[PDB]
Symmetry: C2
Subunit: 398 residues, 2 copies
Amino acid sequence: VSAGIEAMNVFGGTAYLDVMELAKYRHLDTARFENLLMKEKAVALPYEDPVTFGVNAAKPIIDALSEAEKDRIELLITCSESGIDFGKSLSTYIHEYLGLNRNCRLFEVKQAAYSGTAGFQMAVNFILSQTSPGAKALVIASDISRFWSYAEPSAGAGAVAVLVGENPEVFQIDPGANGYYGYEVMDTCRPIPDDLSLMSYLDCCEQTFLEYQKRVPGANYQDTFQYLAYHTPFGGMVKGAHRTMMRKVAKVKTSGIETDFLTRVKPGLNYCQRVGNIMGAALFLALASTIDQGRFDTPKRIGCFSYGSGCCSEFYSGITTPQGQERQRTFGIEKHLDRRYQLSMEEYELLFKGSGMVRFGTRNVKLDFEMIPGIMQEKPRLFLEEISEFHRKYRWIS
Amino acid sequence: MVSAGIEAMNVFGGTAYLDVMELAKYRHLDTARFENLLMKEKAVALPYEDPVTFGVNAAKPIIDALSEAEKDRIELLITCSESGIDFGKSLSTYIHEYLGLNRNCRLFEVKQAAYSGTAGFQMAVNFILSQTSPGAKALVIASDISRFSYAEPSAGAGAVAVLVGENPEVFQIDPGANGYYGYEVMDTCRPIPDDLSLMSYLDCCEQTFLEYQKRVPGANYQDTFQYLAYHTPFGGMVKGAHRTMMRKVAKVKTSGIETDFLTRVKPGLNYCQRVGNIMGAALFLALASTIDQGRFDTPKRIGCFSYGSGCCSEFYSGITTPQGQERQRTFGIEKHLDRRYQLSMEEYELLFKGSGMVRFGTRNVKLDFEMIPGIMQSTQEKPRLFLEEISEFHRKYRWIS
C-alpha cells in the first residue's frame, strides 16, 4: 500500500512585517542581515494562536473534501513548541473547529522543530500499518513566536497542515527510506514560558543522509534527488548547509554548487522568505514551496531533511507528480501570502504591548479585534475571541 | 502478517511514598469520602527527581536485560508526559543519553493528558506493524509527577516503560481492534505552569467500546476479555466505572458485578493503590499490575481503556501469555515498591518547601541529596538516576548506588 501527502496547505499569518524595515527601526546592524535571504516575517496578532493558525491552514483542505473523505480522518496530530497547556493538546480545540469526526485519535508531539516530521512519520506508519484501511490522518504543524535579540527579525509564525492518506499525489514517500539520528545536545531550548545549533544542524544533515544510504543502497545526494527541502530557519543558513553538504558528502567541485543550489534548493526557499522561521513547520513550508515553485512535468524525487534542537533529525524522501502540483495550486498559497496585511512599525510596536495579554498561564482575557483597526475579502477565518478560566473561545470571521 | 506488542514493561513507582490514610488524618479530612476510594499509598517525587529520572529508572532494568544487539535495534523513543520541562526540548533527549541508546533513533514527546501513554504506544505499534524497519524496536516511556484541595492524597508520581517489538510475549495486540474516540471538552486542563471529568470518562468508556465492536464483530464486554485494565486515577472510580459498564453496556444483573469486578479488574488495581494517579502511565501500571497479579496458565485476553482529559480515549486489547508473565516477574515490580522509603508527615512537609526549588522555568539550582538525610543510604539497590543540578536551563543527572 502507498502512503503520503494527499494535500497540504500553508497559513502564513494574517499580518507580516518587512524584516529590513525592522532592522533599521531597532537602530541595528543593517549588514548582518544583508544575505541571510530574509524579506518578510509573519506576525501573530494577540487574537491569533496555534489553534487559529492550524485551523486556518487546515480548513481549505477539509473544505475541498467530500463528507465521506472527511469522516475517514482518524488521526489528528498537531506538532508544536508553542503549546498552551501541559496536558491539553492543541488537537482538541483544532478537532472541534474543523468539525472532524469523533472516531479519531488526537494528540500533540513535541521535539523543537523535529515535531512536524515526527507527526508526519507517525501518520505515514498509521497508513502503512493498515490497522484501519482507507483511513487518513491530518498532521498540522503550528508555531508562533512571542517575546541577544538579533533573533527578533527572523522569528515568524505559521502553520502547515498535511493530509496523509493512501492516494498521495503530492508527495508519496519511499517507505523505509529514512535516516533518523538523535542525541542530547545543549542546543537552543525553550524553558521559560515565552552557534552550537549550526554545528549540530550540519552534523545531523550529514549523519541523516549517511544513515539513509545505509538503508537505500545507490542513493546519491546529487542524482537521486531532483529537489531538496531543508528545515529552513532562514535561507542563508540553508544555502550554507547545502554548500557544506555538496563538498563534504557529495564531493563535487566548488564551481558547480551555485547552479545545483539554484536548480534544486532555491524553489523551496521561496515561501520561507515571506514568513520567517516557523519551526515545526519550516520543513513542510520548504516542501510546499518546492512543489509550487519547481517543475514537475514528470514525477520528481525530493529529499527532505528535518532538524530539531535538543536534538533529533531525519532525512526522508518521496515522489511528487504533476497531478500533485495541480492539487496544490488550487490552494493558491502564494496568492494567500500576497494578501496579508503589512504592519507598520508603530502598529508592530502596539501589537508588542498587547501581546503580553495572551501569555502562557493566561486565565481570563477578552480580545479587541479592532486594536489595529485596519486589519479586519476572503473566506472565513478563525480568531481567538477570549480566554475564560483557561478555556479558549474562538470565532469565525468573514 | 507480523506481530507487535509489549516485549517487556517495567514500573518505577518513586523513591519515596506516603501512607494516604496518615495524610488524611494530618489534613483533618473525612474517613467517609476516602476509604471508599481504594487508595493506600502515593509515590512522591523528591526535588532531586523528575520525569527524566523517573523514566530512566523505569527503563533501565529493561535495557540491562537486553543484549547489545537488541538494545541497538531500539529506533523509536517516545516519552509521554504532562509534566514536560521545556516547550521544545523533549524529555526523550535526556532519557536517550542516560540509557545510552543508539543515535540512529527517532525521539520526541507526546502529550494529551493521560491519553499520552496510549498514543505513544499506538504510534510504536504501527511502527512495528509498518515494517519500515524490520526487526526494530521502540521504547515508550510514560512519565508523570505531581507538584504544588481534596486531590492531594491521590496525586502520585511514576513511570512505566514499555519495550515494543515483533516478539511480544507479555502483551501481543490484536491489530486493528481499536477503540478510539475524541472530542473537545472543557475538562480539567493544566495551563498555569504547576465532575465533568467523570462524565466524559464514562461517555468515552462506553463509546470506545462500541467503536471496538463496530470493528471487532462478536466482541462482547463480558466473555471476550479475561481481565480489564482501565485508566485508573484511583481504584474507587474505576470500580464505579466498571459497574456502570456492566449495567449500561454488558447488561448483566447487579448481583453478579462484584464477582466480575474481583476476578477481572481487581488485579490491575493492585499497584495503583501503591502509587497513586500517575496520569500518562496509569493505564500501563494497571496493565502491569494485571499481568503480575492475575493468572496466565494459558494465554488470556485483556481489554485496556485509556482516557485523557480534553479529551481523547481508546479501547484496545491484546493477548498476554505464560512466557510473558515469567518475563515480567523477573523485574520484581512488587518487591521494588515494597523497598521504597516511607515519608513521615514532617518529612513530607519539608519536601513541600524545597519542591519550589525545581519549578518549571528553573534556570540554576544545585540539589541537596541529603535534605531528607535517610533516603539515600536507605535502599541499597542497583544504581538509580537523580537530578544533581540545573545550569542555564540544562540538566545534570548522576547515578547513585
